[PDB]
């Protein structure tokens, strides 16, 4: 426990879970809704996927 | 405040491609949103101050 010639500063990082509050004003964003589309991707001996 | 209610619209505002948009879509690859507004502003009432 003998002091060395040099001192030191220690740096760390921490995570904190935060529940936030979000405010938004009226007519802030315009959204355009398209038409959904269907495709067939994997046909397997058991079951087929869309 | 015992309100817990709002009156809102039950459906999206529809915007569809009309034929006047469609000729510009095919011919030049451009559409303008509600073409009829722009044509009524330009060619029908020329001045119509803002």
């Amino acid at each position: 426990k003998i002091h060395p010639g040099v001192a030191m500063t220690v740096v760390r990082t921490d995570e904190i879970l935060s529940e936030n509050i979000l405010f938004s004003s009226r007519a802030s964003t315009s959204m355009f809704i398209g038409t959904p589309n269907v495709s067939r991707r994997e046909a397997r001996v058991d079951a087929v996927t869309f | 405040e015992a309100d817990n209610q709002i009156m809102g619209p039950s459906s999206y505002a529809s915007f569809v491609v009309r034929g006047e948009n469609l000729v510009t879509a095919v011919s030049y690859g451009r559409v303008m949103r509600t073409f009829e507004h722009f044509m009524a502003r330009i060619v029908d009432s020329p001045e119509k101050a803002g």
């Binding site: 994997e42 046909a43 397997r44 058991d46 | -």
Partner: protein, 253 residues
């Protein structure tokens, strides 16, 4: 979704093939000289460890006596002299069906195509090899290396001073550098072979032969199942979605 796999039918005598073997181990076929319509003389890798000499305890519990196997391959000691034994081990693929008979036995495997059974509308299966005598050559030498689509299982059969031994290698990079990385891997065992090279003549110089069994669905990995035989406690790596495409034996040195 692909075309159904080309099955192959085989009639083995039942004394050189256990009924107890799990559905999906790969099998290897040996060519007999004058009669071959009768006994196909197919091998499993656990049998190959006995014909070449806690895996050893299981390999002796399943297979007892060996001289039937020594009769099936009479010239094994002459083939290891000349490096011609790899010219007879052909790869056939993983096991699917085992119709039980007293003298004969009916083995049905998958030569080529996605591995599957045939009775119902094509219930799939998996291919299993034990984790010992198995070396992942992706964790062996390890910016960021890219993540490829597809992974290849190779087989190598190597004539060390304690006889020949087989290994299965799992990588995903390419065929043109798996040879070079496999030379880098078998460098120290090569360093132990050239003690008694100088009296022996030109044919012995070959160190082993490499084939490419197939391409299984990568970006997933494998699992670690076991054997449920009586005394077993035998860990076995299993892989799904396997597509068999046995290759030729390419020489390494």
């Amino acid at each position: 979704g692909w075309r159904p796999p080309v099955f192959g039918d085989f009639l083995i005598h039942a004394s050189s093939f256990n009924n107890a073997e799990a559905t999906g181990t790969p099998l290897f076929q040996f060519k007999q000289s004058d009669p071959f319509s009768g006994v196909d003389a197919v091998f499993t890798p656990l049998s190959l460890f006995i014909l070449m000499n806690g895996l050893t305890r299981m390999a002796n519990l399943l297979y007892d006596s060996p001289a039937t196997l020594a009769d099936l391959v009479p010239d094994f000691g002459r083939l290891v002299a000349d490096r011609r034994f790899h010219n007879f081990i052909t790869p056939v693929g993983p096991l699917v069906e085992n119709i039980k008979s007293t003298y004969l036995n009916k083995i049905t495997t998958v030569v080529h195509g996605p591995v599957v059974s045939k009775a119902i509308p094509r219930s799939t299966v998996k291919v299993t090899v034990p984790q010992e005598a198995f070396v992942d050559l992706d964790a062996w030498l390890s910016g960021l290396q890219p993540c490829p689509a597809d992974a290849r299982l190779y087989v190598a059969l190597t004539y060390e001073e304690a006889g020949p031994r087989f290994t299965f290698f799992q990588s995903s990079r390419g065929h043109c550098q798996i040879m070079n990385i496999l030379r880098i891997y078998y460098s120290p065992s090569i360093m132990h072979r050239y003690a008694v090279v100088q009296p022996l003549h030109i044919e012995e110089l070959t160190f082993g032969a490499v084939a490419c069994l197939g391409t299984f669905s990568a970006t997933d990995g494998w699992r670690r199942s076991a054997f449920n035989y009586r005394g077993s406690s035998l860990p076995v790596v299993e892989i799904d979605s396997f597509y068999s495409n046995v290759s030729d034996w390419e020489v390494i040195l």
